[PDB]
Design an enzyme around this catalytic site. Structure first.
Site, mmCIF file in Angstrom:
data_model
loop_
_atom_site.group_PDB
_atom_site.id
_atom_site.type_symbol
_atom_site.label_atom_id
_atom_site.label_comp_id
_atom_site.label_asym_id
_atom_site.label_seq_id
_atom_site.Cartn_x
_atom_site.Cartn_y
_atom_site.Cartn_z
ATOM 1 N N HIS A 66 -12.942 2.811 -13.555
ATOM 2 C CA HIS A 66 -13.503 1.359 -14.028
ATOM 3 C C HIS A 66 -14.223 1.072 -14.902
ATOM 4 O O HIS A 66 -15.552 0.846 -14.954
ATOM 5 C CB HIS A 66 -13.967 0.701 -12.511
ATOM 6 C CG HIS A 66 -13.091 0.471 -11.298
ATOM 7 N ND1 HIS A 66 -12.426 -0.483 -11.285
ATOM 8 C CD2 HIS A 66 -12.629 1.351 -10.286
ATOM 9 C CE1 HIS A 66 -11.486 -0.641 -10.256
ATOM 10 N NE2 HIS A 66 -11.637 0.609 -9.498
ATOM 11 N N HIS A 70 -9.744 0.957 -18.893
ATOM 12 C CA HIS A 70 -9.050 0.254 -17.750
ATOM 13 C C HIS A 70 -8.862 -1.258 -17.962
ATOM 14 O O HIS A 70 -7.798 -1.731 -18.167
ATOM 15 C CB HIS A 70 -10.060 0.221 -16.354
ATOM 16 C CG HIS A 70 -9.324 -0.488 -15.244
ATOM 17 N ND1 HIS A 70 -8.005 -0.436 -14.835
ATOM 18 C CD2 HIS A 70 -9.815 -1.349 -14.426
ATOM 19 C CE1 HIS A 70 -7.848 -1.293 -13.912
ATOM 20 N NE2 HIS A 70 -8.768 -1.748 -13.748
ATOM 21 N N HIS A 104 -12.747 -8.535 -15.740
ATOM 22 C CA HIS A 104 -12.416 -8.399 -14.329
ATOM 23 C C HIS A 104 -13.158 -7.428 -13.507
ATOM 24 O O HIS A 104 -13.135 -7.248 -12.357
ATOM 25 C CB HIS A 104 -10.975 -8.492 -13.775
ATOM 26 C CG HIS A 104 -10.508 -7.174 -13.879
ATOM 27 N ND1 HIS A 104 -10.468 -6.418 -15.123
ATOM 28 C CD2 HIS A 104 -9.928 -6.195 -13.044
ATOM 29 C CE1 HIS A 104 -9.705 -5.218 -14.735
ATOM 30 N NE2 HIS A 104 -9.363 -5.124 -13.531
ATOM 31 N N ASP A 105 -13.811 -6.280 -14.235
ATOM 32 C CA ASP A 105 -14.516 -5.074 -13.848
ATOM 33 C C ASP A 105 -15.827 -4.896 -14.713
ATOM 34 O O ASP A 105 -16.043 -3.819 -14.756
ATOM 35 C CB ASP A 105 -13.653 -4.002 -13.658
ATOM 36 C CG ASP A 105 -12.805 -3.442 -12.470
ATOM 37 O OD1 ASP A 105 -13.197 -4.033 -11.384
ATOM 38 O OD2 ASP A 105 -11.899 -3.018 -12.492
ATOM 39 N N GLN A 267 -0.649 9.131 -2.570
ATOM 40 C CA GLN A 267 0.013 8.373 -3.625
ATOM 41 C C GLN A 267 1.017 7.812 -3.094
ATOM 42 O O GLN A 267 1.224 6.506 -3.253
ATOM 43 C CB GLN A 267 0.046 9.022 -4.841
ATOM 44 C CG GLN A 267 -0.865 9.332 -5.962
ATOM 45 C CD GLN A 267 -1.152 7.948 -6.437
ATOM 46 O OE1 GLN A 267 -0.385 7.455 -7.336
ATOM 47 N NE2 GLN A 267 -1.975 7.269 -6.089
HETATM 48 C C1 LIG Z 1 -5.521 11.854 1.272
HETATM 49 C C2 LIG Z 1 -5.119 10.343 0.968
HETATM 50 C C3 LIG Z 1 -5.036 9.468 1.939
HETATM 51 C C4 LIG Z 1 -4.691 8.328 1.621
HETATM 52 C C5 LIG Z 1 -4.393 7.931 0.346
HETATM 53 C C6 LIG Z 1 -4.543 8.813 -0.680
HETATM 54 C C7 LIG Z 1 -4.725 10.066 -0.450
HETATM 55 N N1 LIG Z 1 -4.117 8.268 -1.929
HETATM 56 C C8 LIG Z 1 -4.029 6.962 -1.751
HETATM 57 C C9 LIG Z 1 -4.228 6.093 -2.774
HETATM 58 C C10 LIG Z 1 -5.542 5.756 -3.644
HETATM 59 C C11 LIG Z 1 -5.663 4.749 -4.440
HETATM 60 C C12 LIG Z 1 -5.979 3.661 -4.317
HETATM 61 O O1 LIG Z 1 -6.355 2.626 -5.037
HETATM 62 C C13 LIG Z 1 -5.320 2.607 -6.138
HETATM 63 C C14 LIG Z 1 -5.889 1.343 -6.923
HETATM 64 C C15 LIG Z 1 -5.045 1.321 -8.414
HETATM 65 C C16 LIG Z 1 -4.115 2.348 -8.627
HETATM 66 CL CL1 LIG Z 1 -3.209 2.199 -10.037
HETATM 67 C C17 LIG Z 1 -3.879 3.527 -7.735
HETATM 68 C C18 LIG Z 1 -4.827 3.385 -6.672
HETATM 69 C C19 LIG Z 1 -4.539 4.625 -5.744
HETATM 70 O O2 LIG Z 1 -4.257 5.873 -5.878
HETATM 71 N N2 LIG Z 1 -4.210 6.648 -0.572
HETATM 72 C C20 LIG Z 1 -4.013 5.486 0.099
HETATM 73 C C21 LIG Z 1 -2.792 5.504 0.733
HETATM 74 C C22 LIG Z 1 -2.138 3.898 1.220
HETATM 75 C C23 LIG Z 1 -3.097 2.871 0.856
HETATM 76 C C24 LIG Z 1 -4.245 3.101 0.595
HETATM 77 C C25 LIG Z 1 -4.831 4.196 -0.042
HETATM 78 MG MG LIG Z 2 -12.651 -4.414 -9.160
HETATM 79 ZN ZN LIG Z 3 -9.352 -3.342 -11.951
#
Ligand SMILES: Cc1ccc2c(c1)nc(CCc1coc3ccc(Cl)cc3c1=O)n2-c1ccccc1
Ligand SMILES: [Mg+2]
Ligand SMILES: [Zn+2]
Length: 310
Positions: A66, A70, A104-105, A267
């Site tokens: 952030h 970004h 925005h951040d 992911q």
């Molecule tokens: C062990 C594990 C369990 C759950 C996980 C994880 C790993 N990595 C994730 C995703 C993490 C994540 C969160 O916010 C974001 C915001 C912007 C962007 Cl570009 C990418 C991301 C991103 O990669 N989740 C996740 C899955 C579903 C919904 C939310 C988070």
């Molecule tokens: Mg934010």
């Molecule tokens: Zn953002």
């Protein structure tokens, strides 16, 4: 001000999958370029735009994701969208939204909203929900008001308190939490057919997915760009776990470094419950934005490949 863009990049900027990665010296100049291309060079006076972009920048901090890179990337994706949808967003709108994406951040600490509320953090005491989001807006308004920073000066006061509203609104919409509902309502206005760009609060709803789609655009970049952006994202989350662990609390598996192994699965779940629906409803509302969702699919299947070990 003195900056001119390496004319080689003039076409590659207009790509939906462009990566500002290699070009950090140029990031402030790029934004200006993207402003100059959109609302014209003589949209804002050149001198008070540089003060602004430069103050803004200094108020992004050394955190993994952030950060200043970004923000400018988000401003890039909004640029692309606004252009690939040229005659459908008002004069003032294109002014508001690029600035908003860039801001925005602002002053983002690197910690989630849920963190700041779990631990009665002073900002969360100020802002009861969208704790950072409102601070990001609070920072934006503050920096406008600096001597010689108010780029929106020669707008009529009325247009001036419309800019703002777009900016406040568009910055608040970046709270993912709000995203899910905003996109559901839009999926229904489409099914139903009752969505009407003349009605202001449908635009605000569309602007918000536009803001979300920008916020997540790293998911829409080329796989070797995206694979190495993800490292930036978890780096932060795992710091936010490292502090949750230090108190003897187990972080969520998203923010736990001990489970780096599970990230590919994680992911993939993210793209399926967040990213892909976002760009789907967006492409249904802004058909030219299909490259985002096309590259979102491509990237998704890359993680599937990595889950399946290829
Ligand atoms: C062990 C594990 C369990 C759950 C996980 C994880 C790993 N990595 C994730 C995703 C993490 C994540 C969160 O916010 C974001 C915001 C912007 C962007 Cl570009 C990418 C991301 C991103 O990669 N989740 C996740 C899955 C579903 C919904 C939310 C988070
Ligand atoms: Mg934010
Ligand atoms: Zn953002």
């Amino acid at each position: 001000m003195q900056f001119t863009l390496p004319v080689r990049l003039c076409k590659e900027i207009e790509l939906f999958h462009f990566d500002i990665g290699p070009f950090e010296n140029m990031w402030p100049g790029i934004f200006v370029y993207m402003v100059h291309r959109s609302c014209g060079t003589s949209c804002f006076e050149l001198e008070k735009l540089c003060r602004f972009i430069m103050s803004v920048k200094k108020n992004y901090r050394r955190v993994p994701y952030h950060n200043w890179k970004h923000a400018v990337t988000v401003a890039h994706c909004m640029y692309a969208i606004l252009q690939n949808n040229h005659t459908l967003f008002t004069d003032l709108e294109r002014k508001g939204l690029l600035i908003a994406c860039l801001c925005h951040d602002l002053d983002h600490r690197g910690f989630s909203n849920s963190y700041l509320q779990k631990f009665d953090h002073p900002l969360a005491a100020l802002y009861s929900t969208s704790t950072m989001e409102q601070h990001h807006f609070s920072q934006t308004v503050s920096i406008l008001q600096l001597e010689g920073h108010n780029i929106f000066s020669t707008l009529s006061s009325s247009e001036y308190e419309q800019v703002l509203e777009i900016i406040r609104k568009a910055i608040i919409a970046t709270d993912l939490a709000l995203y899910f509902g905003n996109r559901k309502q839009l999926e229904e206005m489409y099914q139903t057919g009752s969505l009407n760009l003349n009605n202001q609060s449908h635009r605000d709803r569309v602007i918000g997915l536009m803001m979300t789609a920008c916020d997540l655009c790293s998911v829409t970049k080329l796989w070797p760009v995206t694979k190495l952006t993800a490292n930036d994202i978890y780096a932060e989350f795992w710091a936010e776990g490292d502090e949750m662990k230090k108190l003897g609390i187990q972080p969520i598996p998203m923010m736990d470094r001990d489970k780096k192994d599970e990230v590919p699965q994680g992911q993939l779940g993210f793209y399926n419950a967040v990213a892909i629906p976002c760009y789907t409803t967006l492409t249904q509302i802004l058909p030219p934005t299909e490259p985002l969702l096309k590259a979102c699919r491509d990237n998704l299947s890359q993680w599937e490949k990595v889950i399946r070990g290829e």
